[PDB]
Design an enzyme around this catalytic site. Structure first.
Site: not given
Length: 129
Positions: A35, A46, A48, A50, A52, A59, A101
């Site tokens: 990562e 990203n 979209d 957003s 990281d 995110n 989650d």
């Protein structure tokens, strides 16, 4: 800060990640490796829109506030800059709500694709833990 492998594992360990929600410590270290490649300041934009952030690339769409992700949720109640810090306290904690989650660690594409089903044990071999 760029952590050393044994040094990242000591710290994650210290912060209750070894077997957190049944994910042994090498999963977490592997995850970290692929990562951010152990860099607390790694950032990645990203598609979209957003971003990281940090050691485990959390995110902005859901977990942190960066001032520039429209209809972003800030679930870990933190400004995303706190995730780029030398002290991975905010990253571990925020990751604990993530893993919890529903998708376990599948939440990290890098874990799913390069850690999952591998001998993640090799990641902490040699560490005085």
């Amino acid at each position: 800060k760029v952590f050393g492998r044994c040094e990242l594992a000591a710290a994650m360990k210290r912060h209750g990640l070894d077997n957190y929600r049944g994910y042994s410590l090498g999963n977490w270290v592997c995850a970290a490796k692929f990562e951010s490649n152990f860099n607390t300041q790694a950032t990645n934009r990203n598609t979209d829109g957003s971003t990281d952030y940090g050691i485990l690339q959390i995110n902005s769409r859901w977990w942190c506030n960066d001032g520039r992700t429209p209809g972003s949720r800030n679930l870990c109640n933190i400004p995303c800059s706190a995730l780029l810090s030398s002290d991975i306290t905010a990253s571990v904690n925020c990751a604990k709500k993530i893993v919890s989650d529903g998708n376990g660690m599948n939440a990290w594409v890098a874990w799913r694709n390069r850690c999952k089903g591998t001998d993640v044990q090799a990641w902490i071999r040699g560490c005085r833990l």
